[PDB]
């Protein structure tokens, strides 16, 4: 019987179905790259209020939101417009992510479409039962006050409809490469975004030297709250030891992590990668967190790495350690006795 | 014109469209029986969080709920899981009962899928405009405290989204057959459930010796509140007189009925059944209720009955006469002056 | 690519998509006329609780609402029934107006289907993002108190889910034609309704001597609040001057308009119509409103007019100038110092 056969097949499902949704200009640009470079077992959805930007984007599925409100002509940097446009097209957004076990929402906060629509996409995602994760950036300071204030209000709004919320503050990118021009600024930020999003997705979906169980992934991210990342990599031969230390000292991981529970670790490298190096990585990280933190990790081989091991660290539950101001994220300053 | 022809046809509709929805293990088992034995003009919908149980079930329509939450692997006796799973699949549940004039929701309360999903199915049913009736059982006491507390909380939740709520307390079954083994326990309870559900459905949908008008059915059940049943039957020749007295004295009808408004009576028997016997039944019952109670009744002939008349009594509006405790239903004890 | 081609085509869209929805007897009758006489670029949707009335109606789309509640047998003058019936069929109502840039909701308030369902249709319309305008009538006084009280409560309910709400009080029709019989009463009211609805639609959708931009239409009506109309026309040769004065003195425009912002003006006439006459019309009206009022206007040629110019005035934002009583609309009486 068709129904019964359908029920049996479901039980044989082997991999988690993942969907990546990019909103606004920056988000569509991230999506275009993932589609071209490829992103192991994950469909791509692009959404915009701006028709031209959507046309030049490459993705499995495109949705023009706010057709009646904006008219395919952008949201002009206004968050409230991006939000009403998304609410207006909620039905189409929902049908595009309906069968997903997990949904990644990515965009650069600061403008009108991404900042306004991301929280709406996340709310629809949770309503349908998918693990809902966001990977977004805060704007550079040179972009100015209005852009940051809008980004911060959007981060707040997004926190409420998200399982784990991963924030990358673009301004820290200058601490990685001090004298960089705005030209290459958004090029570096692009790189970081792809590594974070692709690193998390592959950790969950790419066959490695140890199996990572989606049910564990879900248990840790279900209450990931606010999260931050760290990226490091070594070319030497004492690789692991150096990549992890670099990742842990990354300016991107701008928060006190000793009180963290949960964390996801993805160690990448060449054919000669060993569970031994991965383990050294995990334990070095494992000691800086809470003694009872849950850690999810994996290890994958990447041809293009040639002779390097890259380490991606996502540390969760740090919201209590951060302060959300109109001007950005500031490491919290706890009150004396 | 296709539209106009469609509108005319609707006016020619003759019978109420009924749907029976069974949730969880016990509910699916009840559905499997109804489908095989047949149930005059009513489609069958089975829903479960457990794939295996759904596979071995027989029904017109099957829905695996909570696919992302539980993974076709049951709800493990947790009501909150059954509830989120149902909310997660609300769209599919709705489309399955969308065109129903009336919806019957049946399950055994106590576990996780039925207790949690029944109130959700009932809420969707009312939202679409269907007469919403539930026929459920409370667990035996030997099953223990946790199972009863969960059943009671579910009954409460279900009361709020239901037109009339029919409760069968399995523990009373021992007063019918005193020394019975757990083996046959759930076999007796199965029998009772089928007679209640099939008795109500046929009363509404089976051609009898008097026509029962769906609009009257709807008027009485629209405010049936909490309801209880009674079953009796006579083999003698003073049949009617005995079946009704047995039904009225049934341990299943564990409440003071003198203050009841509304009631549904279904008298069943062989080819020799007469409107005379039905009427004696009705009047004997009619005198124990409120002097202004509304009674809906019918009379049908059943080949398999050979030489017996069976009487099904459903007495509504008794909630004020019952006390809902964590440990079960207790006849209420009104406060003195 | 199909998606991309689809996105490009959207950018080439030239006209606003308009839908007219008539509810109840009077509304269906208005719809039947619009469909036959034709109504430049606007689809017609008819909805009723009464099957017979829906059958004899002519429209692009018909929807029988409340199929489970009422059974194609009307709502018997009860607003609460009309409302539950509409809520019950919300999904079908929504799909019928889903792709509309603008939605006009018309009916005669006073009975059960129109009064109850109009606010529901308007709420669905706003939810999807369409400009939501209502054009409705208040009953004659000879119809009695109950009919007016129900009409007034419906107007109140409708105000909350509408962008601009246009009210035509049928009782004023006697000031236009003093000694008129009930026979011709509803015939005159029919005429007025068609001119108001068709006048507004054509102003937005009919090619004229000056282009009216939908975006301006939307900006003015977005906050039109309560609106009233005025109709005038001249056969002479000092046409414009007379039509506008007649329109401005119309008993239909029963409110103090000096404090009005926004207004829509549609001047119609024969082949010899000139932007000069239209302009005289606009300026004569423009001086009675607030010095900063926004006015939207157009001018169209109608063959059937032969030698007359007709003027349609819709003046918005007058709610503060009106008093909503159980017995009707009364020009407000501001409180002294
Ligand atoms: N990594 C990148 N970040 C970018 C890029 N362009 C902008 N951004 C970041 O995102 C912010 C603005 O993003 P978008 O241009 O995508 C704004 P959006 O399209 O969502 O709003 P509207 O233009 O109003 O439609 C800006 O403040 C930057 O911090 C880019 O090419 N790469
Ligand atoms: N009449 C019957 N009642 C049953 C039967 N099995 C269980 N029950 C009653 O229902 C209660 C448990 O029912 P189910 O096994 O259907 C619980 P459910 O499937 O809804 O929850 P999960 O296992 O967590 O998925 C139990 O407390 C009993 O009182 C049966 O075969 N027949
Ligand atoms: N312009 C017209 N107005 C009408 C006409 N018939 C009624 N009406 C007005 O509308 C009011 C009643 O309208 P309907 O007959 O359409 C009431 P409806 O169908 O919505 O309610 P139910 O009969 O309960 O289904 C009445 O109080 C009148 O003021 C008509 O032919 N033309
Ligand atoms: Mg943009
Ligand atoms: Mg089970
Ligand atoms: Mg009618």
CSV table of N, CA and C in Angstrom, one decimal, chain A residues 114-164:
chain,number,residue,atom,x,y,z
A,114,UNK,N,17.2,42.1,5.2
A,114,UNK,CA,17.7,41.1,6.1
A,114,UNK,C,17.4,41.2,7.5
A,115,UNK,N,17.6,42.4,8.1
A,115,UNK,CA,17.3,42.8,9.4
A,115,UNK,C,15.8,42.6,9.8
A,116,UNK,N,15.0,43.0,8.9
A,116,UNK,CA,13.5,42.8,9.1
A,116,UNK,C,13.0,41.5,8.8
A,117,UNK,N,13.4,40.8,7.7
A,117,UNK,CA,12.9,39.5,7.4
A,117,UNK,C,13.4,38.2,8.2
A,118,UNK,N,14.7,38.3,8.6
A,118,UNK,CA,15.3,37.2,9.3
A,118,UNK,C,14.5,36.7,10.5
A,119,UNK,N,14.0,37.5,11.4
A,119,UNK,CA,13.2,37.1,12.6
A,119,UNK,C,11.9,36.5,12.2
A,120,UNK,N,11.4,36.9,11.0
A,120,UNK,CA,10.1,36.3,10.5
A,120,UNK,C,10.4,35.0,10.0
A,121,UNK,N,11.4,34.8,9.2
A,121,UNK,CA,11.8,33.5,8.7
A,121,UNK,C,12.1,32.5,9.8
A,122,UNK,N,12.7,33.0,10.9
A,122,UNK,CA,13.1,32.2,12.0
A,122,UNK,C,11.8,31.7,12.8
A,123,UNK,N,10.8,32.6,12.9
A,123,UNK,CA,9.6,32.3,13.6
A,123,UNK,C,8.8,31.3,12.9
A,124,UNK,N,8.8,31.3,11.5
A,124,UNK,CA,8.0,30.4,10.7
A,124,UNK,C,8.7,29.0,10.9
A,125,UNK,N,10.1,29.0,10.9
A,125,UNK,CA,10.9,27.8,11.0
A,125,UNK,C,10.6,27.1,12.3
A,126,UNK,N,10.5,27.8,13.4
A,126,UNK,CA,10.3,27.2,14.7
A,126,UNK,C,8.8,26.6,14.8
A,127,UNK,N,7.9,27.4,14.2
A,127,UNK,CA,6.5,27.0,14.2
A,127,UNK,C,6.4,25.6,13.5
A,128,UNK,N,7.1,25.3,12.5
A,128,UNK,CA,7.0,24.0,11.8
A,128,UNK,C,7.8,22.9,12.5
A,129,UNK,N,8.6,23.2,13.5
A,129,UNK,CA,9.4,22.2,14.2
A,129,UNK,C,10.8,21.9,13.8
A,130,UNK,N,11.4,22.8,12.9
A,130,UNK,CA,12.8,22.6,12.5
A,130,UNK,C,13.8,23.2,13.5
A,131,UNK,N,15.0,22.7,13.6
A,131,UNK,CA,16.0,23.2,14.5
A,131,UNK,C,16.3,24.5,13.7
A,132,UNK,N,16.2,25.6,14.4
A,132,UNK,CA,16.4,26.9,13.8
A,132,UNK,C,17.7,27.7,14.3
A,133,UNK,N,18.6,27.8,13.4
A,133,UNK,CA,19.9,28.4,13.6
A,133,UNK,C,20.2,29.6,12.7
A,134,UNK,N,20.6,30.7,13.2
A,134,UNK,CA,21.0,31.9,12.5
A,134,UNK,C,22.5,32.1,12.6
A,135,UNK,N,23.1,32.5,11.4
A,135,UNK,CA,24.5,32.9,11.4
A,135,UNK,C,24.4,34.3,10.6
A,136,UNK,N,24.6,35.4,11.4
A,136,UNK,CA,24.6,36.7,10.9
A,136,UNK,C,25.8,37.6,11.3
A,137,UNK,N,26.0,38.7,10.6
A,137,UNK,CA,27.1,39.6,10.9
A,137,UNK,C,26.5,41.0,11.4
A,138,UNK,N,27.3,41.7,12.2
A,138,UNK,CA,27.0,43.0,12.7
A,138,UNK,C,27.8,43.9,11.7
A,139,UNK,N,27.4,45.1,11.3
A,139,UNK,CA,28.1,45.9,10.4
A,139,UNK,C,29.4,46.5,11.0
A,140,UNK,N,30.3,47.0,10.0
A,140,UNK,CA,31.6,47.6,10.5
A,140,UNK,C,31.2,49.0,11.1
A,141,UNK,N,32.0,49.6,12.0
A,141,UNK,CA,31.6,50.9,12.6
A,141,UNK,C,31.6,52.0,11.6
A,142,UNK,N,32.6,52.0,10.6
A,142,UNK,CA,32.6,53.0,9.6
A,142,UNK,C,31.3,53.2,8.9
A,143,UNK,N,30.4,52.1,9.0
A,143,UNK,CA,29.1,52.2,8.3
A,143,UNK,C,28.2,53.2,9.1
A,144,UNK,N,28.6,53.5,10.3
A,144,UNK,CA,27.8,54.5,11.1
A,144,UNK,C,26.8,54.0,12.1
A,145,UNK,N,26.3,54.9,12.9
A,145,UNK,CA,25.3,54.7,14.0
A,145,UNK,C,24.0,54.1,13.6
A,146,UNK,N,23.4,54.7,12.6
A,146,UNK,CA,22.1,54.2,12.2
A,146,UNK,C,22.1,52.7,11.8
A,147,UNK,N,23.1,52.4,11.1
A,147,UNK,CA,23.2,51.0,10.6
A,147,UNK,C,23.4,50.0,11.7
A,148,UNK,N,24.2,50.5,12.8
A,148,UNK,CA,24.4,49.6,13.9
A,148,UNK,C,23.2,49.5,14.8
A,149,UNK,N,22.5,50.6,15.1
A,149,UNK,CA,21.4,50.6,15.9
A,149,UNK,C,20.3,49.6,15.3
A,150,UNK,N,20.1,49.7,14.0
A,150,UNK,CA,19.2,48.8,13.3
A,150,UNK,C,19.6,47.3,13.4
A,151,UNK,N,20.9,47.1,13.3
A,151,UNK,CA,21.4,45.7,13.4
A,151,UNK,C,21.2,45.2,14.8
A,152,UNK,N,21.5,46.0,15.8
A,152,UNK,CA,21.3,45.6,17.2
A,152,UNK,C,19.8,45.2,17.5
A,153,UNK,N,18.9,46.1,17.1
A,153,UNK,CA,17.5,45.8,17.3
A,153,UNK,C,17.1,44.6,16.6
A,154,UNK,N,17.7,44.3,15.4
A,154,UNK,CA,17.3,43.1,14.7
A,154,UNK,C,17.8,41.9,15.4
A,155,UNK,N,19.0,42.0,16.0
A,155,UNK,CA,19.6,40.8,16.7
A,155,UNK,C,18.7,40.5,17.9
A,156,UNK,N,18.3,41.5,18.6
A,156,UNK,CA,17.4,41.3,19.7
A,156,UNK,C,16.1,40.5,19.3
A,157,UNK,N,15.4,41.1,18.2
A,157,UNK,CA,14.2,40.5,17.7
A,157,UNK,C,14.4,39.0,17.3
A,158,UNK,N,15.6,38.7,16.7
A,158,UNK,CA,16.0,37.4,16.2
A,158,UNK,C,16.3,36.4,17.3
A,159,UNK,N,16.7,36.9,18.4
A,159,UNK,CA,17.1,36.0,19.6
A,159,UNK,C,15.9,35.2,20.1
A,160,UNK,N,14.7,35.9,20.0
A,160,UNK,CA,13.4,35.3,20.5
A,160,UNK,C,12.8,34.2,19.6
A,161,UNK,N,13.3,34.0,18.4
A,161,UNK,CA,12.7,33.0,17.6
A,161,UNK,C,13.7,32.1,17.1
A,162,UNK,N,14.8,32.0,17.8
A,162,UNK,CA,15.9,31.2,17.4
A,162,UNK,C,16.4,30.2,18.4
A,163,UNK,N,16.8,29.0,18.0
A,163,UNK,CA,17.4,27.9,18.9
A,163,UNK,C,18.8,28.3,19.3
A,164,UNK,N,19.6,28.6,18.3
A,164,UNK,CA,20.9,29.1,18.6
A,164,UNK,C,21.2,30.3,17.6
